[PDB]
């Protein structure tokens, strides 16, 4: 009886929040860029951060201000303190009484008055000024909330009797659901009233807190003169279950919304979203008497696209059906056939609009598996699309491939595992890939009824491969397209973007070709080779792209010597930069050959000498323009004895330098415990030659346990002026890195250092000297000295002499930070703590997140400005009551010393102060 009472009882969960807060600022800069970075790269926790960490948009705690109640993001350029503070953002008044906001330090540059608006002289001269000061008037807030949770025992459903011509028994199937429900008192700030059914908040839908006054917030509170507060009670629930399965042994029928299914690639790659609402039936004949050892299986799908959706949507009156059948006659070779169809009904043929084909009918067969020591992967498809309209003129498009290679479990092809193995280690000829491709030009995700895909995933990386992990397009080979200059509006000149990149028009050409990658394992020797030619579907050599190559390695004792030859002959246009540095579209010929020798004495040390020679379009081509990466079979070898693996990808980042110019911390990464500067490569294949010693601390029997350094020298070829055939190895790069953690006593030291003396502009790094050093100390609590002190520390210096074609400017930075925590302070359970941080910078800047996956970074700019961010943060604690105080100042002067901080132009820095009293309480 007690269990029955508990099953359907409410758990009452009240919550109380108590806290005092005051904050005064004049510019709202950011202070999270001063705090130490943890070994996982996260910044140390403080009581002043505004938050804002978003992985989707790349936002971090360092992209927003931390004072007042405002989280104003930092603004790049001069409007912000070069990414250090908030923008100036004048306000512009209009004649009709409307207003706009101008984001700049000079309103005169407001070159965007709308068509009919005229600046009315209402403010200073029609331009106002948005106040840069934010205030949080000191107050103590008590927040009270209450929720009612359920026992969570309603996770099952049992079927009931049904039927009209008959009556089912009932209680035959038990389904596990994922319903999470309870009672809430108040609505979240992000709730809304969805009046359209799209499931998303359209333009100002309802603001559910505004629909139910008194639900939450401060705008409305349903009160009582006696002091009572009333809040509406809502029933909140999530239903994560949309599929219901019936039947156990041979036959299982699943009914639900947005059914996800997969016949094969090129036909019903309809998982990762699903296609619509309906049912799927799966029949497994693995226990049949006569034929059950072949594991016969049948799948059948019926559904309506997107369920019910309004007209003008692609899935209105459109229904899909399909059936697949497969077996495994041999060890693992599964062979299957499948029929798929999608079409409009009489209500979709009329009043649907869009462009969905009147009918698509695809047939196919596939032969994936591993049977007799070899792995086969084949696929055939036929489309027969009915292109709506009136005449239609049904169009057919096939897609066939046959590959002898190893597919992973995620259906991506692993080209590093042979799958042939025609011998042992002494004589070990290994076939890695042997494939043919006949994808037609008109075969897209509509031809074979899928969600996405069947197009080059990169067009710059391996562009014959359609495999797209983002959209779940599991398909080995892609529908290639031909690229050409656009010339949309202007005539005579090709259209370009603002950055100068070309604008291309892509026409699908399909794909047809073959490719073999193999390697023969000798004894102390090993050899490998690859060949690959792909044309358009029609076979015209105007779209051919052939890559051939081969490598040979000899490794013995502690010496290894490799030699690689790579070619790329692309009559296919290809987009790339020329010698001058302007993007172009046109055929390419790349010839590379690299001989690199390595010696490993075994004491953790290593030495490496290399000579790599690129040759683009017949000229020596100081740097290849990424063309060699257009093929998916690169297959270089690796140094070391007994390492005869022919792994795909030309390891161009081997024994060469790094060209990074961005960093999370103020100093050039030498103060970031999540960045190993000695393992930073450029990943660009150069026409150069050089040597590089080093030392690894993770390798056992090393001189120093945790020590890594990467001293190295190199010389890079550069043409005579810009495009001359003649040239010389005049460029010179001398680089060095070091990293040493150690733990002397109770403290935990960490040293990092980097150097560079480049002579030319390699990828984006200018030509000049570049050095950096950083030290991090973190003492554990001392149990001998009174107060149990626990110290910290941080120092970082960065220097760079950027010799760019527009200046010879020096960009240096200096970051420091110290702090001591007293874990035993007078009264019991009393703690005190103080941390002082500082960051000075010459011509450097911060670039905030771009709103995409890219994050913000500190870089060098020629802005003649010196930033002087400083702050002190004192955190004391009684038993569990935390007093946090913080005072920070940001001043950005110029060479003269004008002190542009606090940009009202009064010669005063921006200042921020905060005081908080925090107290966490639980019921």
């Amino acid at each position: 009886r007690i269990a029955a009472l508990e099953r359907n009882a409410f758990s009452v969960k009240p919550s109380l929040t108590i806290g005092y807060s005051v904050s005064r600022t004049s510019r709202n800069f950011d202070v999270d860029r001063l705090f130490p970075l943890n070994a996982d790269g996260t910044v140390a926790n403080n009581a002043f951060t505004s938050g804002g960490i978003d992985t989707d948009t790349g936002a971090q705690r360092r992209d927003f201000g931390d004072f007042g109640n405002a989280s104003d993001p930092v603004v790049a350029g001069a409007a912000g303190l070069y990414g250090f503070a908030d923008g100036v953002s004048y306000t512009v008044y209009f004649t009709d009484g409307s207003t706009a906001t101008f984001d700049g330090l000079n309103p005169a540059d407001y070159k965007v008055p709308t068509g009919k608006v005229i600046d009315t002289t209402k403010g200073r001269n029609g331009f106002g000024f948005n106040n840069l000061a934010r205030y949080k008037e000191g107050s103590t807030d008590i927040g009270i909330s209450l929720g009612f949770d359920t026992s969570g025992q309603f996770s099952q459903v049992t079927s009931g009797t049904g039927g009209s011509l008959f009556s089912t028994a009932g209680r035959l199937q038990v389904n596990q659901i994922d319903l999470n429900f309870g009672l809430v008192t108040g609505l979240p700030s992000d709730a809304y009233v969805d009046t359209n059914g799209n499931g998303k908040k359209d333009d100002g839908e309802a603001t559910g807190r505004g629909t139910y006054l008194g639900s939450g917030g401060t705008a409305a509170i349903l009160r009582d003169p006696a002091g009572n507060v009333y809040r509406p009670v809502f029933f909140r629930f999530k239903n994560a279950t949309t599929q219901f399965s019936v039947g156990n042994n041979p036959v299982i029928v699943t009914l639900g919304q947005q059914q996800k299914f997969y016949f094969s690639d090129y036909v019903f790659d309809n998982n990762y979203d699903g296609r619509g609402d309906g049912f799927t039936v799966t029949v497994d004949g693995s226990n049949v008497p006569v034929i059950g050892a072949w594991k016969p299986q049948i799948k059948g799908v019926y559904g309506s696209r997107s369920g019910l959706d309004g007209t003008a949507e692609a899935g209105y009156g459109v229904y899909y059906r399909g059936v697949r059948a497969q077996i495994t006659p041999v060890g693992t070779l599964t062979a299957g056939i499948h029929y798929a169809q999608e079409g409009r009904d009489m209500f979709g043929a009329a009043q649907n609009t869009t462009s969905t084909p009147s009918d698509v009918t695809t047939y196919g067969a596939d032969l994936h598996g591993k049977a007799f020591g070899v792995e086969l992967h084949s696929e055939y498809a036929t489309s027969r699309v009915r292109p709506n309209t009136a005449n239609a003129a049904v169009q057919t498009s096939n897609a066939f491939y046959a590959r002898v290679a190893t597919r992973k479990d995620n259906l991506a092809f692993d080209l590093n595992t042979p799958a042939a193995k025609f011998g042992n280690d002494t004589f070990g000829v290994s076939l890695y890939d042997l494939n043919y491709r006949k994808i037609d030009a008109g075969y897209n995700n509509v031809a074979g009824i899928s969600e996405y895909g069947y197009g080059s995933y990169s067009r710059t990386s391996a562009q014959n491969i359609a495999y797209n992990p983002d959209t779940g397009v599991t398909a080995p080979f892609a529908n290639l397209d031909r690229q050409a200059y656009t010339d949309a509006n202007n005539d005579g000149t090709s259209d370009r973007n603002a950055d100068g990149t070309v604008v291309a028009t892509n026409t699908k050409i399909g794909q047809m070709g073959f490719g073999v990658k193999a390697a023969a394992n000798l004894g102390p020797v090993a050899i490998g080779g690859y060949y690959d030619t792909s044309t358009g579907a029609n076979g015209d050599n105007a779209n051919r792209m052939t890559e051939a190559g081969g490598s040979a390695k000899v490794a013995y004792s502690i010496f290894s010597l490799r030699g690689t030859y790579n070619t790329l002959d692309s009559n296919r246009p290809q987009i790339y930069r020329d010698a001058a540095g302007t993007q172009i579209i046109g055929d390419a010929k790349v010839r590379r050959y690299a001989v690199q020798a390595d010696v490993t004495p075994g004491l953790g040390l290593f030495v490496g000498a290399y000579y790599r020679d690129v040759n683009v379009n017949g000229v020596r081509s100081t740097t290849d323009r990424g063309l060699l990466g257009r093929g998916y079979l690169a297959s270089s070898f690796e140094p070391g004895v007994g390492n005869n693996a022919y792994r795909t990808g030309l390891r161009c980042a081997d024994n060469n330098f790094g060209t990074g110019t961005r960093d999370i911390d103020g100093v050039g990464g030498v103060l970031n415990p999540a960045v190993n500067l000695d393992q930073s490569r450029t990943a660009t294949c150069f026409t150069s030659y050089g040597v590089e010693a080093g030392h690894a601390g993770d390798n056992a029997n090393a001189l120093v346990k945790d020590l890594f350094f990467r001293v190295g020298y190199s010389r890079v070829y550069v043409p005579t002026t810009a495009t001359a055939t003649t040239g010389d190895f005049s460029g010179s790069v001398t680089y060095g890195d070091a990293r040493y953690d150690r733990k002397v006593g109770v403290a935990n030291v960490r040293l990092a250092g980097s150097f560079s003396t480049t002579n030319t502009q390699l990828d984006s790094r200018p030509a000049g000297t570049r050095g950096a050093v950083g030290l991090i100390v973190r003492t554990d609590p001392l149990e001998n000295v009174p107060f149990r002190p626990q110290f910290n520390g941080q120092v970082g210096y960065y220097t760079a002499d950027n010799r760019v074609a527009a200046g010879n400017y020096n960009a240096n930075a200096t970051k420091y930070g110290a702090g001591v925590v007293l874990n035993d302070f007078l009264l019991p359970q009393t703690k005190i703590g103080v941390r002082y941080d500082g960051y000075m910078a010459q011509n450097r800047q911060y670039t905030p997140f771009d709103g995409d996956g890219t994050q913000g970074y500190f870089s060098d700019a020629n802005n003649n400005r010196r930033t002087n961010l400083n702050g002190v943060y004192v955190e004391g604690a009684y038993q569990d009551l935390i007093f946090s105080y913080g005072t920070y100042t940001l001043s950005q002067k110029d060479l003269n010393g004008v002190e542009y901080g606090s940009g009202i132009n009064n010669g005063q820095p921006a200042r921020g102060q905060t005081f908080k009293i925090s107290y966490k309480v639980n019921f």
Binding site: A3, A4, N248, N249, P250
Partner: peptide
């Protein structure tokens, strides 16, 4: 075919108690 439904109907048991029943192997 390959599944087993088992209906143990018990009577004269304890008024409102829970009765977890399963299959104990030979041991």
């Amino acid at each position: 075919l390959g599944v087993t439904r088992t209906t143990i109907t018990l009577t004269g048991m304890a008024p409102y108690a829970i009765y977890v029943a399963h299959y104990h192997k030979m041991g």
